[PDB]
Design a protein around this ligand. Structure first.
Ligand SMILES: *[C@@H]1O[C@H](CO)[C@@H](O[C@@H]2O[C@H](CO)[C@@H](O[C@@H]3O[C@H](CO[C@H]4O[C@H](CO)[C@@H](O)[C@H](O[C@H]5O[C@H](CO)[C@@H](O)[C@H](O)[C@@H]5O[C@H]5O[C@H](CO)[C@@H](O)[C@H](O)[C@@H]5O)[C@@H]4O)[C@@H](O)[C@H](O[C@H]4O[C@H](CO)[C@@H](O)[C@H](O)[C@@H]4O[C@H]4O[C@H](CO)[C@@H](O)[C@H](O)[C@@H]4O)[C@@H]3O)[C@H](O)[C@H]2NC(C)=O)[C@H](O)[C@H]1NC(C)=O
Ligand SMILES: NS(=O)(=O)c1ccc(SC(=O)N2CCc3ncnc(Cc4ccc(C(F)(F)F)cc4)c3C2)cc1
Ligand SMILES: [Ca+2]
Ligand SMILES: [Ca+2]
Ligand SMILES: [K+]
Ligand code: NA
Ligand SMILES: [Zn+2]
Length: 805
């Protein structure tokens, strides 16, 4: 109930909302059917439109007009935004040459440069180039300020998840806005684009920018705008708020536009109809900037121009139907379109089986335009598992396609020509970033970055302490002129042991054998030095990874590789080796095929044993340092140490062996050497974070050898590929992956073929940031380089995407 009988007299666009039954006058009142009776009349005036004209200059104040051109407007804070240009002969902001803003030039009473975030829905990255000719205001922001070629959204590339991510710095699995449509089973309640359930606060987790500011004494403009408030009115309202008294005036503001998403859905991303909405957004930017110029705030405010996601060509004829795969299509509920989320229709149907749904959806048709995944098997880069609102079964839809349950869902809902929601590495999904202002750099291009990183920057811009989030604070310091955040490296928590030779061969009863009984003071001292770390400078190029949790581990040196060996997990946490451009690849000699050797530095009690692998009919083993890349027949023996072995399913070994035998050498040839760090990951609860021992769900049969859920590799070289990786003076280049350790290759529909036709494709899908691996392992990499820490943080957030230009 709303007593709509009160008035908005002197309260239009009030910041502090009022509580029912009292009627509202804030910028969401329309959305709630709660505005006082006179809100339209008073707060949504449109008379005479939005632009001063020569004749109106100096007019008598008619309170009825949408904006004013009368002499006193600048003092009331309510002039039309072109007032000074039309009436007072000033130039539009966009006609002004750009001049570096070295310092904020703010009116008296301003305690910090305000921030205005100008958000645009569905603003695909390539519009900056393709629409350049019709967006002069945005082009000026872009060219004069700081911009990225693109900004990467989060998955799913839908509006609500992305805007909330921008506002929180969190992945959707952590803020809880996991799609535009959702069912939460604990609440037993559904979130929809339409209607009122979406307004309950229990859906929206984390702490968004406007709460962060208020909690720390920084006032905020409201970030949500009811759809029916026209853009011109939104801009005028922001400008009005900027003329409030110091003690009342917000320091952070946001504008939202539904375009160009709205027209993109109708016409596709580059439909001829798309030019006009681009034109209209640009004009809105111009109004804002002219208005700031009128207020003498154009060299005071930081402005961010940012999109939530891009847009792809999608038509109703590119739809796959689950009725063409499933016998029991009525037994499931699908969240449809550019992603799929499946669960049972009835929690009382005990004949529901995910296993059979997944099998029926896997590689059943040659051209299949989606792939099914149990959510924990999704690429870790998606961070899309750890929320009860995310259904166990997920469909990753090919770009340009939809999935639906039955044909009838499409035509009893071709209408539309664009959509979005696909894999966030897809080129069409990429969106935009521009920063303009005294705190941003001048005429600066930065590399692409992920939208999770902006919350921290927005906090830096306002002098706020960010709430805990998924950004890496400091990784975007290169965008900023000032207010940079200077973190320290995290402290190492566990120091390693450095064991020497402590065990005789006969103390080991592991059930392992090796044909190695083949016996020189020249090379006997040499091998000693290798075991004491003499080649470590070669193989450990950026220092040892630091262990950020309490544990017991040993550093093991070898000729060709260095490792950090866990006494708890009985295998390495990390193995580090460097392969030059000139390295030769060799085979595992016939005589050593099944060779496994006791490590006389590591107790039998803290070692794996071969008998467990023999008795586990499902599980095999591989090596972290690859015996194929041994520097000499003699050094190859190090590679068969029990301390280099890890559990591997035979299906996985196909992947791993191709990686090790072919791809590492390929990268070394292409990148002029590479440094490789590889290791296990355990993430049985699919939270993105290192498991403790008690979370481990699977062990090699009859033993305490835990089974990894994934294997990672970090592959580093010199960004200037004229310098060898092991003698690099400057910035580094990285590519990494987190490969799922699965007992089959059902993910790869071409896996019956030779590994050259499908392995690298898999690996590319499971590309990762170094930071993803750090979260997953409790390790901190690149501790000892000659580069600044912020530069290293940027490197750790890098994702090698494998998309074209
Ligand atoms: C990305 O960044 C984020 C933010 O830093 C990282 O997420 C954090 O990770 C922490 C560890 O995973 C997690 O810590 C837990 O917090 C519990 C208290 O949490 C509540 O309060 C905070 C503060 O106000 C709030 O942020 C939380 O918000 C979550 O939950 C509400 C719903 O109630 C949601 O609306 C909201 O979106 C958010 O959900 C997300 O997180 C929850 C888990 O919190 C997930 O389940 C969701 O799927 C979703 O992702 C909460 O309201 C705290 O109680 C936990 O403490 C346990 O563990 C300690 C270990 O020392 C132990 O000593 C305690 O005893 C305790 O265990 C007891 O409870 C267990 C469960 O019943 C039980 O098993 C035990 O037996 C014990 O009884 C824990 O510390 C932190 O809350 C989130 N924060 C956020 C915002 O998500 C995230 O990891 C980053 N991602 C990556 C990949 O790095
Ligand atoms: N609208 C409908 C969809 C939507 N979904 C989530 N949050 C919000 C609030 C919001 C608004 C603007 C931003 C940004 F800073 F990027 F500008 C960030 C967040 C909205 C607003
Ligand atoms: Ca959107
Ligand atoms: Ca975990
Ligand atoms: K076996
Ligand atoms: Na397969
Ligand atoms: Zn859309």
């Amino acid at each position: 109930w709303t007593a709509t009988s009160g008035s908005c007299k002197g309260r239009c666009f009030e910041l502090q909302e009022v509580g029912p039954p009292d009627c509202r006058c804030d910028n969401l009142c329309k959305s709630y059917s709660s505005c006082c009776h006179d809100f339209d009349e008073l707060c949504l005036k449109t008379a005479r439109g939005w632009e001063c004209t020569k004749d109106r200059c100096g007019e008598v104040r008619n309170e009825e007009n949408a904006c004013h051109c009368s002499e006193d407007c600048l003092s009331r804070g309510d002039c039309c935004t072109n007032y000074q240009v039309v009436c007072k002969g000033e130039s539009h902001w966009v006609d002004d040459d750009c001049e570096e803003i070295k310092v904020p030039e703010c009116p008296a009473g301003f305690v910090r440069p305000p921030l205005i975030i100008f958000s645009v829905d569905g603003f695909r990255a390539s519009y900056m180039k393709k629409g350049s000719k019709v967006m002069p205001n945005i082009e000026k922001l872009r060219s004069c300020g700081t911009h990225a070629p693109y900004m990467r959204p989060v998955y799913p590339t839908k509006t609500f998840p992305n805007l909330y991510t921008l506002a929180t710095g969190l992945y959707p699995e952590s803020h809880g806005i996991v799609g535009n449509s959702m069912y939460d089973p604990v609440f037993d309640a559904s979130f929809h684009l339409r209607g009122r359930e979406k307004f309950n606060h229990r859906w929206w987790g984390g702490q968004p920018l406007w709460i962060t500011a208020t909690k720390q004494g920084v006032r905020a403009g409201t970030f949500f705008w009811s759809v029916s408030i026209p853009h011109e009115r939104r801009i005028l309202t922001i400008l009005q708020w900027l003329s409030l008294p110091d003690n009342e005036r917000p320091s952070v503001y946001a504008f939202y536009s539904e375009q160009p998403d709205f027209s993109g859905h109708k016409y596709g991303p580059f439909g001829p109809e798309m030019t006009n909405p681009l034109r209209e957004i640009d004009k809105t930017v111009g109004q804002l900037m002219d208005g700031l110029k009128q207020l003498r705030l154009h060299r005071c405010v930081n402005v961010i121009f940012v999109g939530d996601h891009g847009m792809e060509d999608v038509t109703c004829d590119r739809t796959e139907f689950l009725s063409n795969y499933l016998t029991n299509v009525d037994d499931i509920t699908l969240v449809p379109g550019t992603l799929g989320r499946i669960r049972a229709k009835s929690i009382n149907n005990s004949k529901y089986d995910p296993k059979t749904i997944i099998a029926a959806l896997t590689c059943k048709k040659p051209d299949q335009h989606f792939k099914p995944y149990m959510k924990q098997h999704l690429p870790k880069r998606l961070h899309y598992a750890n929320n009860r609102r995310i259904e166990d079964i997920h469909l990753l839809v090919d770009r340009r396609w939809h999935v639906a349950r039955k044909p009838l869902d499409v035509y009893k809902k071709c209408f539309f020509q664009g959509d979005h929601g696909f894999d966030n590495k897809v080129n069409s999904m990429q969106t935009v970033f521009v920063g303009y202002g005294p705190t941003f750099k001048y005429r600066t291009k930065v590399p692409p970055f992920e939208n999770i990183e902006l919350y921290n920057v927005m906090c830096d811009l306002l002098g706020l302490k960010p709430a805990p989030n998924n950004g890496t604070h400091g990784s975007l310091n290169h965008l900023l002129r000032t207010n940079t955040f200077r973190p320290t490296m995290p402290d190492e928590v566990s120091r390693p042991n450095y064991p020497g030779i402590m065990y005789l061969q006969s103390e080991f009863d592991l059930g392992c054998t090796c044909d190695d009984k083949v016996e020189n003071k020249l090379e006997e001292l040499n091998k000693r030095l290798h075991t004491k770390g003499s080649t470590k400078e070669r193989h450990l190029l950026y220092g040892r990874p630091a262990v950020l949790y309490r544990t017991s581990y040993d550093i093991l040196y070898h000729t060709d590789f260095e490792s950090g060996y866990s006494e708890i997990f009985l295998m390495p946490l990390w193995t580090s080796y460097t392969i030059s451009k000139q390295a030769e690849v060799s085979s595992i000699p016939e005589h050593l095929t099944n060779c496994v050797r006791p490590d006389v530095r590591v107790s039998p009690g803290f070692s794996q044993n071969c008998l467990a692998y023999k008795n586990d009919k499902q599980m095999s083993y591989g090596f972290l340092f690859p015996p194929y890349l041994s520097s000499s027949p003699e050094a190859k023996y190090d590679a068969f140490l029990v301390t280099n072995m890890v559990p591997m399913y035979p299906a996985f070994k196909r992947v791993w062996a191709y990686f090790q035998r072919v791809l590492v050498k390929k990268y070394a040839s292409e990148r002029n050497g590479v440094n490789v760090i590889s290791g296990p990951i355990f993430d049985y609860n699919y939270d993105g974070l290192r498991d403790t021992e008690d979370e481990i769900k699977q062990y090699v049969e009859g033993s305490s050898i835990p089974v990894p859920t994934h294997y990672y590799s970090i592959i580093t070289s010199c960004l200037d590929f004229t310098q060898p990786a092991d003698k690099c003076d400057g910035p580094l280049s990285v590519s990494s992956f987190i490969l799922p350790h699965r007992p089959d290759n059902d993910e790869s529909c071409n896996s019956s073929e030779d590994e050259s036709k499908w392995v690298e494709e898999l690996m590319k899908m499971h590309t990762a940031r170094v930071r993803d691996i750090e979260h997953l392992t409790g390790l901190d990499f690149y501790r000892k380089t000659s580069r600044s820490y912020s530069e290293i943080l940027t490197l750790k957030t890098y994702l090698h995407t494998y998309e074209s230009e």
